[PDB]
Amino acid sequence: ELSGTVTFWDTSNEAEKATYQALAEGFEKEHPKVDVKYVNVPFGEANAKFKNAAGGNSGAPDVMRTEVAWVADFASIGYLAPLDGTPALDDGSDHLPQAAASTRYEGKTYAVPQVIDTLALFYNKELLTKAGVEVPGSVAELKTAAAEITEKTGATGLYLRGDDPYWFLPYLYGEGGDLVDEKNKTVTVDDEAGVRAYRVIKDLVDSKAAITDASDGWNNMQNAFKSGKVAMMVNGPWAIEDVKAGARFKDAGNLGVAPVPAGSAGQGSPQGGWNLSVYAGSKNLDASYAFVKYMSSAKVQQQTTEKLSLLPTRTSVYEVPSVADNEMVKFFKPAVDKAVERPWIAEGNALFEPIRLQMANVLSGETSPDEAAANTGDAYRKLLKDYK
Numbered sequence: 001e002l003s004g005t006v007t008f009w010d011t012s013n014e015a016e017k018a019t020y021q022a023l024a025e026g027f028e029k030e031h032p033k034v035d036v037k038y039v040n041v042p043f044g045e046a047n048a049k050f051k052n053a054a055g056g057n058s059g060a061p062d063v064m065r066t067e068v069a070w071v072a073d074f075a076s077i078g079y080l081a082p083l084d085g086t087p088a089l090d091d092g093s094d095h096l097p098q099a100a101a102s103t104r105y106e107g108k109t110y111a112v113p114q115v116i117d118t119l120a121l122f123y124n125k126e127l128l129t130k131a132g133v134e135v136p137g138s139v140a141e142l143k144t145a146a147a148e149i150t151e152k153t154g155a156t157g158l159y160l161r162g163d164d165p166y167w168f169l170p171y172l173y174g175e176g177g178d179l180v181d182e183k184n185k186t187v188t189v190d191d192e193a194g195v196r197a198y199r200v201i202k203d204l205v206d207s208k209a210a211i212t213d214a215s216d217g218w219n220n221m222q223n224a225f226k227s228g229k230v231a232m233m234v235n236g237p238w239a240i241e242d243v244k245a246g247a248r249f250k251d252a253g254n255l256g257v258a259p260v261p262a263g264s265a266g267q268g269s270p271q272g273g274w275n276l277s278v279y280a281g282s283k284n285l286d287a288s289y290a291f292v293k294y295m296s297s298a299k300v301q302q303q304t305t306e307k308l309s310l311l312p313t314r315t316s317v318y319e320v321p322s323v324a325d326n327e328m329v330k331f332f333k334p335a336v337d338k339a340v341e342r343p344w345i346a347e348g349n350a351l352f353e354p355i356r357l358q359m360a361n362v363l364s365g366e367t368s369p370d371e372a373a374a375n376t377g378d379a380y381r382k383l384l385k386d387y388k
């Protein structure tokens, strides 16, 4: 017997949310005495909304779609139910290891993996063909390509998202850098790779290879890509269905995807994704654990991919012929296997804010790449007291 209310806060976007609400309410098929109360909470509001509710014990959800960085964030302040030895964990070993690391805090499991992701370079196949160019493998080749795309088609080569710090990471990795050396507790973002990365992004916009905006970046990016204003953008699996809604990409066929470009030293893209957690103060714990088990089951992960092309965390699901043949999946899974894994620390998501501010000021010309990198590092040393 399961019964009662299970309130689920989902952060999925406008293209994803009808699918996730249907999946959530499908828990009631097998458990008709449970009432699933689906709520969609915008991504940028959800961390604060959950903390406010959990800290007040007031209108907190039973189950929270928890970003990979949010697990240690929320768990560090006691807001998540530990899951070890509960029915929430079924076939745990099925999950990709890097997925499983984000679920852990101080030797306890506080979430179950849902989707895994990384950033990639999406491109308009027809524009590149019309421009006579190949999909660029590096920043250097992207600049050459962008000039041909402007000269032959009038589009801009790249929409470079300028208001979300996560988009700095491919450039950092491509210049040979990283945020921190975790094993050695050393801040590394202000090494010369960080200077070079800020410089590359500024050059892409100044040279007119790319355009950007200081606000409303998600909408501006998607609108520029879908309208053919740009030929390329960096984005993740959560954009696929949104892009395919557009006249230009109905023909799933016109939507190309490739790795983010290499920089002067190498290439990399960050690992991201979503897990599912239970609020520590839930008044319907059995029903919530079962709900988490259901939402993370192989069946529901397979359905998510079939409807949205989001990537499963469960290895078995890749073997299901239907997942094994989705062309967005066949590209993204190897890219995810290569993606760079961050420190899963309480302060992890706070590492993004200094990048946000310094990247904005580099793009507007208020701050040099040199000063931006040093400022980022200074902010990290303040955030991480036992880092040098």
Ligand SMILES: C[C@H]1O[C@H](O[C@H]2[C@H](O)[C@@H](O)[C@@H](O[C@H]3[C@H](O)[C@@H](O)[C@@H](O)O[C@@H]3CO)O[C@@H]2CO)[C@H](O)[C@@H](O)[C@@H]1N[C@H]1C=C(CO)[C@@H](O)[C@H](O)[C@H]1O
Pocket (backbone or CB within 6 Å): 011, 012, 013, 016, 043, 044, 045, 047, 067, 068, 069, 070, 117, 164, 165, 166, 218, 236, 238, 271, 272, 273, 274, 349, 352, 353, 356
């Ligand atoms: C800045 C943000 O970057 C990283 O998060 C990325 C997620 O891992 C991706 O999955 C993707 O999230 C989208 C979901 O897939 C989608 O279903 C829907 O929820 O919309 C999401 C946004 O489009 O993209 C994210 C990057 O945009 C990183 O891992 C994450 O921790 C970072 N978030 C921090 C930054 C801010 C504000 O700058 C806060 O709002 C967050 O609470 C922080 O955690």
